[PDB]
Amino acid sequence: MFLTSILLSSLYLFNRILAWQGNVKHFYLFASNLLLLFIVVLYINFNTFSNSFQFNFELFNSLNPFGLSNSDISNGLLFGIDGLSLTFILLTVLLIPLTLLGNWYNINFNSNLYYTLVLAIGLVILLNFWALDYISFYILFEATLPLLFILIHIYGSSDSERASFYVLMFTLSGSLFMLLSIVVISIVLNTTNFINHNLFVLSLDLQTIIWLGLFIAIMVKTPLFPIHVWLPVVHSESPLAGSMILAGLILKLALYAILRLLLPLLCEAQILYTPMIYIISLLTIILTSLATLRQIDLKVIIAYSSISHMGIAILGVCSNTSLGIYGSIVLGVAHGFVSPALFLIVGGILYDRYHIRIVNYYKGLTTYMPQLATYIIILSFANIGTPLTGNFTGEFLSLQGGFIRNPIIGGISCISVLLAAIYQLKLTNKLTGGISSIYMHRTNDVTIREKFIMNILIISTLIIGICPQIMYNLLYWTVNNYIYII
Amino acid sequence: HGPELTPAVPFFQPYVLKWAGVSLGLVAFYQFNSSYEAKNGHTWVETFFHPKSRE
Amino acid sequence: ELKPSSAIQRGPLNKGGWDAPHALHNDGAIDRYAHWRTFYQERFKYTRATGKSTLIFLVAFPALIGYVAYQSEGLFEFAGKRRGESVTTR
Amino acid sequence: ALFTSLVGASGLGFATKFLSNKIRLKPAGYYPLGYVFSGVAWAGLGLVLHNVHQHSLEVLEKKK
Numbered sequence: 001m002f003l004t005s006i007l008l009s010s011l012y013l014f015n016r017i018l019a020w021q022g023n024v025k026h027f028y029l030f031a032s033n034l035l036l037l038f039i040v041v042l043y044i045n046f047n048t049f050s051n052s053f054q055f056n057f058e059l060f061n062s063l064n065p066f067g068l069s070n071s072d073i074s075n076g077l078l079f080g081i082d083g084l085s086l087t088f089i090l091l092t093v094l095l096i097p098l099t100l101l102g103n104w105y106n107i108n109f110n111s112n113l114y115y116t117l118v119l120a121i122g123l124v125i126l127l128n129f130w131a132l133d134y135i136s137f138y139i140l141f142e143a144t145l146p147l148l149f150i151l152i153h154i155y156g157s158s159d160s161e162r163a164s165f166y167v168l169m170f171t172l173s174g175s176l177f178m179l180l181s182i183v184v185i186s187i188v189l190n191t192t193n194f195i196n197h198n199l200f201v202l203s204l205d206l207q208t209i210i211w212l213g214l215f216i217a218i219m220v221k222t223p224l225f226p227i228h229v230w231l232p233v234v235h236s237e238s239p240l241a242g243s244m245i246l247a248g249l250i251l252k253l254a255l256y257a258i259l260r261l262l263l264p265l266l267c268e269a270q271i272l273y274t275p276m277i278y279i280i281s282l283l284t285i286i287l288t289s290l291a292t293l294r295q296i297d298l299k300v301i302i303a304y305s306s307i308s309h310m311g312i313a314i315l316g317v318c319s320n321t322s323l324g325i326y327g328s329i330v331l332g333v334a335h336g337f338v339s340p341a342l343f344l345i346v347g348g349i350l351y352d353r354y355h356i357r358i359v360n361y362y363k364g365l366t367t368y369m370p371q372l373a374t375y376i377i378i379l380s381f382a383n384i385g386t387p388l389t390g391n392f393t394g395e396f397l398s399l400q401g402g403f404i405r406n407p408i409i410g411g412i413s414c415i416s417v418l419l420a421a422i423y424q425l426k427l428t429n430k431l432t433g434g435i436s437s438i439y440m441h442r443t444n445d446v447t448i449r450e451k452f453i454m455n456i457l458i459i460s461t462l463i464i465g466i467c468p469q470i471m472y473n474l475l476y477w478t479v480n481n482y483i484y485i486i
Numbered sequence: 487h488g489p490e491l492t493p494a495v496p497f498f499q500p501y502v503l504k505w506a507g508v509s510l511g512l513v514a515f516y517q518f519n520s521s522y523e524a525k526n527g528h529t530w531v532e533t534f535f536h537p538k539s540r541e
Numbered sequence: 542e543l544k545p546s547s548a549i550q551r552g553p554l555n556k557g558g559w560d561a562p563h564a565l566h567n568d569g570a571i572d573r574y575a576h577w578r579t580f581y582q583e584r585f586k587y588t589r590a591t592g593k594s595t596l597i598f599l600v601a602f603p604a605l606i607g608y609v610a611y612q613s614e615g616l617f618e619f620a621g622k623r624r625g626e627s628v629t630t631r
Numbered sequence: 632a633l634f635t636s637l638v639g640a641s642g643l644g645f646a647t648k649f650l651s652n653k654i655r656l657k658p659a660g661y662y663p664l665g666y667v668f669s670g671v672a673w674a675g676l677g678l679v680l681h682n683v684h685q686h687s688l689e690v691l692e693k694k695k
């Protein structure tokens with residue numbers, strides 16, 4: 001009665017704020033900021049000394065379909081966290097008001113629609129990291145895509161239509177074979193579960209088949225070289241919050257799914273296949289970062305940058321090392337900080353003012369906007385692997401873990417420090433320097449809200465950069481968990 | 487020989503005040519916990535840490 | 542004899558708001574250039590140069606890095622080493 | 632629990648009455664008594680389905 005009266009009160013308050021204020025965006029910011037307060041109070045009560053799943057709750061059980069269930073027999077949808085989940089949830093929840101902040105004055109026509117879709121996508125990728133079944137991981141893994149289709153199609157550039165199609169198409173088409181592999185697991189074990197599933201052993205000829213269906217879906221979502229194809233256009237023709245939630249959270253969601261779903265029960269498969277992953281990882285670091293050099297458009301460069309950093313990230317995951325797993329997590333969280341700031345710099349401060357994203361128009365942004373050029377350089381250097389930023393901690397421990405498992409793949413994997421600097425500083429000096437452009441008429445300096453978003457997303461890289469030990473209290477179980485060294 | 491001065495600006499800009507206030511507050515709170523730990527054997531915010539027992 | 546009903550009174554659709562004045566002189570040459578570059582794939586055709594790059598970057602380079610990756614799986618440990626100790630397992 | 636199934640099935644009924652108001656291009660609270668009508672109807676479907684599941688579990692207990 002109590003938890004129902006809370007909802008009957010809060011929906012009433014929602015209806016009243018609707019009737020009196022036309023927007024909702026205040027109430028959406030308030031709700032997502034309360035979600036922050038709630039998840040950090042869950043972090044206080046979190047026990048780090050237990051490997052266990054601490055805060056468990058079942059939804060949609062037989063004996064109680066509407067709500068919580070305490071029964072001796074469970075067939076609903078399980079939810080709960082360890083350290084490894086919870087890190088991403090932290091990286092999730094502090095991102096969610098910022099994108100709700102990020103379009104506070106851009107969207108004029110249909111406000112309530114856009115902010116509802118953006119908050120709903122953020123809530124679905126909250127609940128992605130809580131899940132504990134294979135099916136309940138997968139139901140919410142794909143709940144995003146109608147909301148993403150409706151968001152990219154209605155709002156965007158002139159090419160909204162093709163980009164909304166590709167974010168349905170490639171993402172769906174990889175996720176279907178993921179479902180094939182999930183079905184084959186669920187009919188052998190007869191239990192989808194994130195708790196028991198390291199105990200069961202499958203045959204090597206049977207692990208050999210199951211692992212392809214999950215791995216090609218992770219190839220689609222962390223875009224490795226065969227399908228890295230939707231990523232630049234679904235960024236380059238997105239609106240702002242869709243691009244931020246995509247490249248900060250969806251790619252790291254598949255980086256999470258390669259840990260949570262594959263490394264526990266495909267171990268004896270996984271050793272036989274680490275050279276195939278190293279082929280595709282090196283070949284998506286070299287060949288996407290080299291295709292960045294020939295680009296006419298400006299959001300597309302930061303998109304291919306995200307491809308190159310996830311290509312560094314996944315060869316720490318499959319490294320069979322403590323160092324590689326921890327480096328992949330710190331890369332994933334630090335890239336989730338640094339990269340939506342870059343999509344703000346191309347999309348918020350620079351597309352709201354001039355509405356054209358071609359690189360050739362933009363020159364000499366320093367002499368009319370000094371503090372924007374200040375941002376553009378210190379976010380440039382934070383992207384490369386220039387240290388004390390957390391991006392280098394991820395890149396360094398990932399390259400070290402990838403050097404453990406195979407040294408010759410780490411030798412050519414290490415040149416990524418060069419290749420990631422070339423295009424980024426080649427963009428940065430073209431934006432920063434020169435006589436101010438004859439095409440661009442002078443506009444306003446960076447406002448207070450944009451500087452607010454930037455200051456947060458840069459401090460949160462610098463704290464992880466100066467001390468990566470601040471979140472080792474969550475992971476020291478889950479760094480030892482996924483290692484298989486007999 | 488003149489310096490040819492630009493107009494006067496105040497020292498304590500709002501950003502200097504905010505950033506210095508938050509940083510000095512965090513450092514002062516950290517020293518407060520290091521002093522409170524010697525008196526009582528535990529930090530002050532550890533009293534707020536109530537997780538469930540592992541058993 | 543079938544026309545949509547009289548009680549519609551449908552009106553025009555605006556997008557609403559403030560007419561932001563033009564902060565950019567668009568160049569016809571730069572816009573035509575960039576529209577040609579983003580939509581390059583609808584006019585791409587296979588030639589000998591395309592065949593050379595498609596052979597070497599999609600077939601030859603994965604096969605070379607593949608052979609190098611499968612030969613060097615359990616060769617090298619350097620973890621604790623000494624003079625006169627071989628580091629290759631084989 | 633029997634009570635949460637009632638409240639949630641009545642919530643499904645409130646959702647049907649809301650969405651049926653809002654296809655019609657009406658306001659939300661256009662006819663407020665129909666919320667009560669649809670909520671009690673869909674709650675009755677919840678009654679029926681819960682009792683059928685009770686009896687099915689009781690049949691499964693008697694096979695031991």
Ligand SMILES: CCCCCCCCCCCCCCCCCC(=O)OC[C@H](COP(=O)(O)OCCN)OC(=O)CCCCCCCCCCCCCCCCC
Binds near residue numbers: 056057120140
């Ligand atoms: C449309 C896609 C398909 C949808 C399929 C999934 C439907 C999800 C529907 C949303 C409802 C789930 C969230 C609410 C359920 C959890 C509420 C709760 O009470 O958690 C219970 C749990 C333990 O509680 P208990 O065992 O009773 O003991 C308490 C002792 N103090 O207490 C806890 O441990 C804390 C639990 C924290 C939960 C955080 C979840 C973050 C997201 C919250 C908003 C979710 C709404 C998303 C809406 C979009 C739909 C996906």
